Amino acid sequence: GASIFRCRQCGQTISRRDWLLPMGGDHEHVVFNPAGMIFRVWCFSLAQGLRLIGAPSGEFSWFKGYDWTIALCGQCGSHLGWHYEGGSQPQTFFGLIKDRLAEGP
Ligand SMILES: [Zn+2]
């Protein structure tokens, strides 16, 4: 009934409820960036229809031992979150901004 996450702005297919990842205990991580913008971030093992731009950066990574690149919606270019990589258990994952996704069948 509510297993697919789409881009809230354009409906681009991004992930599935089944791909939710409970990093460090819970799949919901409330984090702030250096600009002080708070994000409810949901961790996914897998995502699709994104465009990863920029170089991977360790600077300000919310997750110890992970570099992040910016994840845009491949369709509309809305900032949906980050790809994380360079870590362990697992090596990679996605941090997507809950309020920029729409859940549905
Ligand atoms: Zn979009």
Cα-to-centroid distance, 99 and ligand 1 (Å): 12
As given in the structure block, the two tokens for residue 99 are 């309020």
Does the annotation place 59 within a ligand binding site?
A: no
Cα-to-centroid distance, 80 and ligand 1 (Å): 8
Structure solved via? X-ray
Residue 104 to residue 59: CA distance in whole angstroms: 34
As given in the structure block, the two tokens for residue 15 are 């992930």
Does the annotation place 26 within a ligand binding site?
A: yes
Residue 14 has phi, psi (to 5 degrees) of -120, -50
β-partners of residue 28 are: 42
Cα-to-centroid distance, 84 and ligand 1 (Å): 20
Q: Are 51 and 76 in contact (CB under 8 A)?
A: no
Alpha helical stretches, state H, 1-105: none
Cβ neighbour number for residue 44 with a 10 Å cutoff? 23
Whether the bond between 105 and the residue before it is cis, its omega within 30 degrees of 0, is: no
Domains identified in the chain and CATH numbers = 2-105 (2.170.150.20)
